[PDB]
């Protein structure tokens, strides 16, 4: 048997605690702030191979988002979601105007330019509810299965403490 | 910064990263590259493939908060290109996943194509040609040994 397990064990690969049996299986949705860098790792107690980590502009959870996640479940073995919003993010305070004057300024046609402001401007609420309103994608997304708990935290930017917004499990 | 990371690599931010969400990235990038707390933005997804998503991010560091310089580093090992369909078919059936959404989904992200290499430079036209993208933001494309760190430019800009 030994000549067996061998054989299995040449294709054997500990990358992460995905690999594992015992060990969670976290993603972490967040935003692409500075300043969330080592300071939420920190926070979190979270390490190199601790937790798969989606980041985009405002951890705001679309399409994009939910497709990694799935990639996260179905090929990492995550079980557990957790999204985490901070406080000063300001994609719930963006100046329309003057990010459409500066487009309007390098030439960017004008067709253009109206999609932006559709599609990242004008659908947005604030921190602790857009944390909400994705938990909510996130759990009536038919990618995402029940069987997987989806949490939302607000992280306070400067001193690292979190402020649960929704608990599951 | 470009040249000081690669130079860094040997061994208010102005600096967009665009990664994977592969957790041995967690921590060995930030020593890789030098970066460290309000250095940067990050996006991350799924095997840092460039989509609506990531350009709309970019775009929003870019004309909101004074972004003048992308750097997308792919990994190698990366599990966007060694895909095991029917295994995660098997997963998603197991999870009680209708089969509608089964086969939509692996049509829309099971068939990437591509190495992690490609993936990069892919990348690199997509934000390149992007109307979203001033023609004066650098844009690079580098690729990190997920296990040393050691820094492999595949195109750097300007
Ligand atoms: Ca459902
Ligand atoms: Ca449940
Ligand atoms: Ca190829
Ligand atoms: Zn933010
Ligand atoms: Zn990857």
Redesign the interface.
């Known amino acids: 048997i030994i000549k067996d397990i061998l054989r299995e064990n040449q294709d054997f690969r500990f990358?992460?605690?995905?690999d594992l049996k015992h060990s969670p299986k976290l993603?972490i949705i967040t935003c692409?702030?500075?300043?969330?860098?080592?300071?939420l790792?920190r926070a979190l107690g979270?390490?190199?191979?601790?937790?798969?980590?989606?980041?985009?502009?405002g951890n705001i959870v679309?399409?994009?988002?939910i497709?990694?996640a799935?990639?996260?479940?179905?090929?990492?073995?995550d079980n557990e979601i957790i999204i985490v919003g901070h406080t000063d993010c300001g994609?719930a305070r963006?100046?329309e105007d003057?990010?459409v004057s500066?487009?309007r300024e390098?030439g960017?046609?004008e067709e253009?330019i109206e999609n932006?402001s559709i599609?990242?401007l004008n659908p947005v609420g604030d921190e602790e509810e857009n944390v909400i309103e994705g938990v909510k994608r996130l759990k009536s997304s038919?990618?995402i299965?029940e069987?997987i708990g989806v949490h939302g935290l607000i992280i306070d930017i400067n001193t690292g403490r979190l402020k649960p917004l929704y608990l599951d499990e």
């Open positions: 990358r992460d605690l995905s993603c692409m702030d500075s300043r969330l860098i080592d300071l790792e979270i390490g190199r191979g601790d937790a798969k980590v989606i980041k985009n502009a679309d399409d994009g988002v497709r990694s799935a990639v996260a479940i179905y090929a990492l073995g994609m963006l100046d003057l990010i500066r487009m390098l960017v046609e253009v932006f599609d990242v038919p990618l299965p069987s």
